[PDB]
Symmetry: D3
Subunit: 316 residues, 6 copies
Amino acid sequence: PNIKIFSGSSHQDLSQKIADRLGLELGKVVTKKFSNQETCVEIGESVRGEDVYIVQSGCGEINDNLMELLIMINACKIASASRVTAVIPCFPYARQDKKDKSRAPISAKLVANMLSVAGADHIITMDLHASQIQGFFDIPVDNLYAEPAVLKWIRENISEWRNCTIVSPDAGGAKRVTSIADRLNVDFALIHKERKKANEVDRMVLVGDVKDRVAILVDDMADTCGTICHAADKLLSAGATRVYAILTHGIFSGPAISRINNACFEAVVVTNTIPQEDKMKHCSKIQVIDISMILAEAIRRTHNGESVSYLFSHVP
Amino acid sequence: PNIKIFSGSSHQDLSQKIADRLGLELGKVVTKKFSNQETCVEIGESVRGEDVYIVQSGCGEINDNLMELLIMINACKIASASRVTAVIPCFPYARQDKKDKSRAPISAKLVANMLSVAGADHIITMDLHASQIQGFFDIPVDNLYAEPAVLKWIRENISEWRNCTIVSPDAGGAKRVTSIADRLNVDFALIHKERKKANEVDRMVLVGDVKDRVAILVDDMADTCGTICHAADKLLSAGATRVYAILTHGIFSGPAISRINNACFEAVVVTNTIPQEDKMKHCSKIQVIDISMILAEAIRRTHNGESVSYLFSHVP
Amino acid sequence: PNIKIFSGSSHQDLSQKIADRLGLELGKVVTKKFSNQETCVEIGESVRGEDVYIVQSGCGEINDNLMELLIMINACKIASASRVTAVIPCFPYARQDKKDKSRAPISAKLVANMLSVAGADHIITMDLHASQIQGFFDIPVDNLYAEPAVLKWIRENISEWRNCTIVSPDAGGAKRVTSIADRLNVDFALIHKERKKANEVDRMVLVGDVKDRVAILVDDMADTCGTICHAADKLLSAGATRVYAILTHGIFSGPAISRINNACFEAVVVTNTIPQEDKMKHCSKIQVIDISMILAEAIRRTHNGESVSYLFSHVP
Amino acid sequence: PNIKIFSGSSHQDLSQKIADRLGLELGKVVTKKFSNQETCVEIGESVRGEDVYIVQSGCGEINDNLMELLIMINACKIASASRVTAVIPCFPYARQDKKDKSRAPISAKLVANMLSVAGADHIITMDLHASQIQGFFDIPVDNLYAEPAVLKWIRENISEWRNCTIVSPDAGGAKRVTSIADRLNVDFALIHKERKKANEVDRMVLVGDVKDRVAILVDDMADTCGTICHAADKLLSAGATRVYAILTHGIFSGPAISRINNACFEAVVVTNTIPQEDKMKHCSKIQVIDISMILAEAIRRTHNGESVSYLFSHVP
Amino acid sequence: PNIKIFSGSSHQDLSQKIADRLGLELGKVVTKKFSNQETCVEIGESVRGEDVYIVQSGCGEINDNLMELLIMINACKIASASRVTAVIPCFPYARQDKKDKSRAPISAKLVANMLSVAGADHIITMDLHASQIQGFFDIPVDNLYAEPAVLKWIRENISEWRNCTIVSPDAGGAKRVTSIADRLNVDFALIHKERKKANEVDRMVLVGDVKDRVAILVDDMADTCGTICHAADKLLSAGATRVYAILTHGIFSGPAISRINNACFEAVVVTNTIPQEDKMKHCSKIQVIDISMILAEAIRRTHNGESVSYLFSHVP
Amino acid sequence: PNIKIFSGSSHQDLSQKIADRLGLELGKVVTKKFSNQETCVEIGESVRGEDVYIVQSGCGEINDNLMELLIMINACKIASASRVTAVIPCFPYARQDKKDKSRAPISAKLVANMLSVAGADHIITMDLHASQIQGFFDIPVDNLYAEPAVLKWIRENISEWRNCTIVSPDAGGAKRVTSIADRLNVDFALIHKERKKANEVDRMVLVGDVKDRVAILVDDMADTCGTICHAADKLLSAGATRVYAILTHGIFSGPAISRINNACFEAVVVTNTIPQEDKMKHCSKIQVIDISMILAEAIRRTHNGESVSYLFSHVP
Ligand SMILES: Nc1ncnc2c1ncn2[C@@H]1O[C@H](COP(=O)(O)OP(=O)(O)O)[C@@H](O)[C@H]1O
Ligand SMILES: Nc1ncnc2c1ncn2[C@@H]1O[C@H](COP(=O)(O)OP(=O)(O)O)[C@@H](O)[C@H]1O
Ligand SMILES: Nc1ncnc2c1ncn2[C@@H]1O[C@H](COP(=O)(O)OP(=O)(O)O)[C@@H](O)[C@H]1O
Ligand SMILES: Nc1ncnc2c1ncn2[C@@H]1O[C@H](COP(=O)(O)OP(=O)(O)O)[C@@H](O)[C@H]1O
Ligand SMILES: Nc1ncnc2c1ncn2[C@@H]1O[C@H](COP(=O)(O)OP(=O)(O)O)[C@@H](O)[C@H]1O
Ligand SMILES: O=P(O)(O)OC[C@H]1O[C@H](O)[C@H](O)[C@@H]1O
Ligand SMILES: [Mg+2]
Ligand SMILES: [Mg+2]
Ligand SMILES: [Mg+2]
C-alpha cells in the first residue's frame, strides 16, 4: 500500500504542506457542493489497497467540512482502500465531550461514532480539547501535542522566558499550563472566571504571582477570545509587564479579531491546525507555528509502522 | 409514553402544522449555532420514556440541518426517550443512492447509517427518491406517498384532467407517472434527455402523444428545474396546449425560480415537505399542497400502533 | 494471497469457465446434502490467507443455493481466508427490494445482511434488479453490466439494428432501455401493463412508434416471461416487423419455455448468469451470451487491486 | 401487547395445537413460493406492538423452512412487532455445532447469527442437540426438555419399566440416558460404534448389562435410524428381551422407515416437534408424544413474564 | 416493571441502605466463588420484565467485583429483565481514561465496552474521575455529584468555612475546587507536584494564599493518600492553620491509613461509595458522608422516568 | 508481520517454553497491580503491524488473569497490531457453557464476548470443556487436543496398556474416553455419580468391566479431584488392579492435593496448560506432560498460514 493524501475543503494549504513534506502530490479529489447544498465528493483516482489519509480540520463551515470528511471516508472505504485515516488537526465538537446538563448531547461521541461508521480505521489529531476523546473511538487515535513547538517558540521569541509565568486562562487548562511550566522550569498561575450566578459583573480571580513578570497565556483554543482577553485584562491589572497568548487551535470566530486588536497582547500565537491567512490579514498580533511537519511525520510513521512517541519530545 | 414533537430549524412551519393537527404544542428545543458554527441543541424538557418525533426536512442548509437532526436524535436517546422517530419529509442525499461511478459514495446509505448510529428507531419520510432507501435501514421506514394529494389536486384544479396526459420528465419517473395515469385512467408520456456524449445541443426525445392535450409533468422533485423546464419546452414544441408541473419536493435551488418564471407552466405544484414561503414570493406559478395532515396522521398512527396503509388511498 | 475460486452447486459450468479464464483449477469443495436435506459443505483445501471467490448464482433451488453460499462463506472466514468474495451473477431476492405493502419483508436486505454476517467482504454481481441493492451492504458491491455484451450481440446479430427500436417491457426498465437506445443511437419505446383494478382483461399501453421496425425488448430478467410475451404480442399488434428479447438473467421458471415457444420472438437472448443448458434443449429461440469473461476479469482486477471501470465499456 | 402465533409451512398441525391450547387463532400468513422458488411471505394482519411467536421446525425442506422463518421474523420486526420469538421445536443444523474438522463450518452458529440478524428477540426450542447452542445467541434461548413426557410415557406404556435399562445409542447420549435412568431409578447402559479406521465391518461395543431385561434406547433424534437400529441389533445380540426406542426429534429421513420396519423395536416413540403423520402411515411401530402443551405453556409463560422451570418437572 | 435491587459482594451495606430508602428488600442473589476462584452468581428470583439495578462499587477485589457485576448483568439480561442498570458508585479503572503513553490501554473504555456487551442499559455512578467517561458508553450514564453533600458537610462541620480556602491537591482537580469555592464564595488554591525528571526530592508548588486560614483539600479520590498527604505538608508549610481533606471516593489502599494517621488532617471526609467500616477502625480521622439517599433517589427517579437534576442542587 | 509472544502473569514458564521453541524472546511486558488492585499492563515495545500472541491460561487468580488478558489484547489492538491472538491453554469459565438453571449465566459466552470486544482476532486453546465454545466466537478458535500426547504417555509409561480399560469419571467424558479407547484398541468403562436427590450417601454406578485390569481415568480436567477420587474408589471396589488418572487441565484447587495424596492413584498425569510446579511439590503422584511444543507449533503454523491438522495426529 502507498500513502494517498486527500484534502477536504477546510484546510488545503495544510494538506499541501503535509504532501510536500511527504514528497507526494495531493490525491485528486473534487470537493464541491451540489446546487441544493449537498456535499459532492468526486475522488479522481483509484485508492484500491492504498493507505488513505484524509486531511480535514474542524473549522470554517463545520458541518459542511465534517460531512465532506465522512463522505470521503466512506467513498474510500467502498473503493476498497486498505486503510482510511482521518487527519483532523482540530477535532470538531470536541468541547461537547460530556453530559453535564439535562438532555445535553455528547456531540464529540456522536462525531466519533459517525467517523467510525463511515469507516475510519485511524484518527490523527492535535491537542484534543479532552484527551479522553481518544476513548470515544474503538480505533487507534493519535492525539499529537503542539507543546514541543510551543516550547520552541517560547524559547526563541521571548527573551525573558526563564523569568516568565505560564498562565492558565481557566481551571481546565491547569494541566497544560503546569506541564509547560515544568518543561520551562518557570512559575505558573491560574485565572478563573467564577460562575455567573446572576447578571452582575463577570469577575476573575487570579491564583499565583504575575507582578512585574512576562505572562504567557497558554490554552488549547481561542474561539471567541473571551477567555484569553479577560485573562489578559486580569493579568495587566495584576501587574504583568507583557502578556502573550499561545494557543494550538486558533478558531477566532465572531468578535475574536476585534477583541484581540483591542487587547494588550504582545503576540497571539496559534498553530496552523486551522487556516489563519484571513485572520492574520486583520490582526497583526497573530503569529502562526507551522505544525505541518508534525502531522507529516505522524502520517509517515503510521504508514511505516513506527512509533510517534518521538513527536512528543521534538519538533521535526 | 406520550407523543413529543420536536422541530429542527429546517421546516418549523410544517412542524407547527403537525403539532396543531395532533393537538399538541411543539416540544421546547433551542436549535442554534455556537460562534464557531457548531450545531447547538438544547432540549428544554424531559423526554424520559416519551415517544419522540423529530421533524427535520432535508432542505436549506442541508448539512447543518442533518447534523441538527442527528444531534437531537442522540440527545433524545441519551435522555432515555422510549422511542425516537426521525420525521424527514424530504430525505437528504436521497439522489446518491447507488455507486454507478468509480469511487462514488452512496451518500444516502451513509446518512441512513448516521441516523441509525444516532439512535433513530423509526423513520417517517415522503416520496423517497428511491424506495429502496427503506432498505438502507434496519429499522422500519415509512415511505409516505403524496400521490393521493396529487390526484386530489389534479381532479380539483384541472378542468380537462380526464383528457390530460401525465408526462414523465425523465426515464426514472416512469413508474410514478404510470401509477398516476392508471389512477386517473388517462394517457401517459415519457420524455428522455439523451446522454451527453459531447458538447452539442441537449436534445429531448418524447415517447407518447401530447398534441392538443393538457400535459401534466409529474416528478418526485424539482431541484434546479432543468428537468421540468426542458420537458416543458419539449411538450410545447410537441403541441401540448397547457403544461403543468407537479412535484412532491420543491427544492427550487439555484436558478430554479428564474427558470420557472421564464417557463410556460400553468402552475408548478409542490407539497410543503420543504418550506415554500420564500419561493412563492418570487414565483406566482408555485402552488403548495399541504401534506401536514398526512404526516400528522402517520405520527398519530405510529404512536397508536395502527396501520398507515389508509394514507396511501386517502388524504385525511 | 492467491485467488481461490470455489463453485457452489448452482452454476458450476460458469465457475469452470471463470477458472479457465483465470488459468486456475476450481477449489476442491464437496457441496452436497445430508440425509435430512441440510446443506453439507466440505472445503477440501486450505484457504488460509487466500483471496477466496465463491461463485453461486441465485437460481435453481434458490434457498438451497443461498444457504450453500452462506455456509461456504462462513467456512472460508473461520478457515482464516484473507478475503471472501461472493460472486453472485444473479442476486437472489433482488425483486424484494422495498416495502411497498403492509408487513412486506425487504428480502434483498435480509439476504445482504445474511451475506454480511456470514463474513463476505466483497460482492460481485451482474445487473442487479435495483442498483440500490449496492447500498444494502456496508462492503463494496460490484454491479457489473451486461450492456456492452448486449450491444455487441445487437450489432453483430441484427442486420437492421440502426433502424430498430429498443422497447421496455415495463415502466421499471425505462432507464436500461434509454441507455441502450442512446448507445445505439436508435429510437426507444415503452410498454406498460396497467394495474389490475379488477378481473377484466389485462391491457397493455405502448408509448413510442414501433410500426414496420424491428423491436428489441430489453429487460433485466425473464422469470415467467409473462412480461416479455405480453410485450411481444403488443409489439406485433402495433406493427413491429420482428421482435427480439434480450435479458441478462434468464430464469425461465414455470411456464416460460412454453410461453416463449408459442411467442413470436426472433430470438430470446440471455447471459449465462444462470445455467441455460436445460432451457436451450426445449426452446430453440434461446441464445446465450457468455459473460464468464466479464466475471473473470472482475475477479482478476479485484485481486490485483485494479479498477473494473473498463468492464463497463468493453467486452474482454 | 397480545400473543400472535404465526405458522410456517413446516409444522402447521403443531402450530394449530399450540394456538388451540392458547385459545387463539393462528395469525393470518400466506407462506408460499414464487415461481422461481423464492420464499414468499405475506403476513395478513398487523403485528404492531404485538408479541409475535413464529412456529417453524427444522424439518422437511430444511433450507426452505429456515428461509421462511427468517423472512417472517424480519417482516414482523420491520412491521414494528413489540417482540419476535422464533419457536423452533427442532433446531436446524444443530448437529453442526463445532469445528472438529479442517475448514468445517459451524452451521448452528451461522443459523443463530442469521436468526439474530433477522431480528429474533427470543428462541424457544426443544432438546437442542447440544445445549451449548443456547450460547450461540445473545438473546434468551429456551431449551425445553421432552424428558418429563418421556418419563410419563415410559411409566404408562412399559409394564416392566422398573426393571428396565435405559441405553444410550452413542457416547454423546450418555448424559441424557443417565438423567433418565436416575429419574426412573433404573440401570443404564451405553452402546458405542467404534471409529471407522478402514472398510471392515462396523462393530458395536456395549458397556452395561441388558441381558433378560427390557432395553429402552433414548436419544435426542433419529435421522436415518442407523444409530438406533444398530444399537437395537446389538441389544438383542446381548440378550435384551424387548427393545424400545424413544426420541424427541423423529426426522426419519432417507432409509429410516424401512430400517425401523425391519428392526426389532417394540415401539419407536417420538415427539411431534416434527410432523409424523406421513411417517406413521408407513411404520406402525412409530408412536407420537404430543408436546404441543409444553410449547404452548412456554409461549404463555414467556408472554406473561413467568418462569418456565415448571415445564422441566411436569407435563401440563 | 418493578425495581429489583441486587447487591454484589463489594458494598452490600450501601446496597442495603439503598434498598431501605426505596422501601424494598434486596433481591435474592448468591455471589460466591467456585473452588477454582471463578465467580459464581446465583440469582435466586425471577427478574422477568423487571427493572433491575445491580449495585457494585469498584473497590476491594476490583477484578473479582467487576467480573461479578458483568456476570450478574448478563444473567439478568438472559433472564429477560426489562432493563438492567449498573449502579457503580466508584467506577473501576476510571483513572485509565486516555492513552498518553505508548501502548497504554484505555482501561476505562474497555470496562465500558465490557459493561455494554454484558447487556447494561443504564449506568449510575458518582463523581467519575473523568466526566468524559460518560462518552465511553452508548447508553445513558448518570454521573452524580457528591458536591452538594460536601457543601453541606463543610457548612455544618467547619466553623470558619466562610474564611476558608478550598485547595486542589493537583492540577486535575482545579475544576472541582473552583466549583466548590464558587458555591461557598471562598478563595481557592492549587497545589502541583512538578514532574519527576530525575531522582531528586519531590517538590510541591502552591499557587494561592492559604496563610492563617483553614485549608480544605477537595479531590475526587484518595487511593494511596500520597496526593493529599503531600498537599497537607505543603499547606502547613505555607501557613495554613488547619487542613481538612474531603474526597468522594475513599479507596485508602496500601499505605494510606498509616499516611493519614501520621498526617496533620483535622478530618478526612469521604462518601460511602466504597465501604469504610474497616478503614474507620484504624483511622479516627476518617468521617463518612452517607450518599445512599442520593443513589436511592437516582434509582427511584430512573424507574419513575423523572429527572435527576434535583440531585445536583440538593441532598435528599 | 513478525511473531510477538507476550506472557500474562498466569503461566510464564509455559510462555517461555513456547518462545524458546519458536526461537524468540518473550515480548517486553510489565504485568503488575496498581495499589488499589487494578490490573496494570505496560507493553514495553512496539507491536505495530505485528502478529501478537498473548499467552494467558485460565488458572490461579482467574478474574485477575482474564482482566490482564483483556487489557493486553486491547492495548495491542489500539497499538495497531496486525493481529492479536489469545493463547488460552485452559479456557476460563468453560464449565459455564449453558443455561440449564433458572437465571443462570452462560459465563463462557460472556468471556468469549469480552475477548471479542477487547479485539482478539484468533483464539488458540487446548481441550475446551465443551467444543461448542468454538461457536461462542465469530473468530477462528483453535481447539487443540492433548489426546496424542496422552496416547504417547500411555504407550510409554503403562506396561499393560494393551489390556487396560479407559474409564470415564462421568457421563460427559464418554466421547473422550471412547476416542482414546478406539485409538488404543482397548476396552472402555464409564462411571456415573447419580443425582443428589436428598442427603443420603453419594453412590457411583460403573458400566463396563474393570476387574483385574489396569484402569486409566481420562477426563478433561481435575479441579477438586472429587470426580477422579470417587471414580478411583469405585474402580478399586470393582476389582481394578491399578488406577491411573490422566487429565489435560490440572487445576487442583482446594482439597485436591490432599485428596490425591490419600487416593490410590498410580499416577495423576496432567499437561502444563496450568502451572504445576507448586502442585508437584506437595503431591509426588502428579506427573506433567509438556504441551508447549503443541502450542508453539500451533502459533507457528497460524503465523505461517499452515494447517494445524498435523497437531491432532502427532506430538511435535
Ligand atoms: N509521550 C506521550 N505523551 C502523550 N501521548 C503520547 C505519548 N507517547 C505516546 N502517546 C500517545 O500514544 C499514541 C501512539 O503512541 P506511539 O508511541 O506512537 O506508539 P504505539 O501506537 O505503539 O502506542 C500517540 O498517537 C499519542 O496519542
Ligand atoms: N461506468 C460505470 N457504470 C456503472 N457502474 C460503474 C461504472 N464504473 C464503476 N461502477 C461501479 O463501481 C464499482 C467499482 O468501480 P471501479 O471503477 O472498478 O473502481 P473503484 O472500486 O475504485 O470505484 C463497479 O463494480 C461498479 O459497481
Ligand atoms: N430445571 C431446568 N433444567 C434445564 N434447563 C432449565 C431448567 N430451569 C430452567 N432452565 C433453562 O432456563 C430457561 C429459563 O428458565 P426459567 O426458570 O423459565 O426462568 P428465567 O428465564 O428467569 O431463567 C429455560 O428456558 C431453560 O432453557
Ligand atoms: N446540573 C447538573 N450538573 C451535572 N450533571 C448534570 C446536571 N444535570 C444533569 N446532569 C447529568 O445529566 C444526567 C441526566 O440528567 P437529568 O436532569 O436527570 O435528565 P435527562 O436524563 O432527561 O437529561 C445526570 O445523570 C447527570 O449525569
Ligand atoms: N482432526 C481434527 N480433530 C479435531 N479438531 C480438528 C481437527 N482438524 C482440525 N480441527 C479444528 O480445526 C481448526 C483449524 O483446522 P486446520 O486443519 O488447522 O485448518 P483450517 O484452519 O483451514 O480449518 C483446529 O484449530 C481445530 O480446532
Ligand atoms: O473437581 P471435579 O468436579 O472433581 O473435577 C471437574 C469435573 O467437573 C466437570 O464435570 C469436568 O468435566 C470434570 O469431570
Ligand atoms: Mg478551557
Ligand atoms: Mg428523476
Ligand atoms: Mg487528580
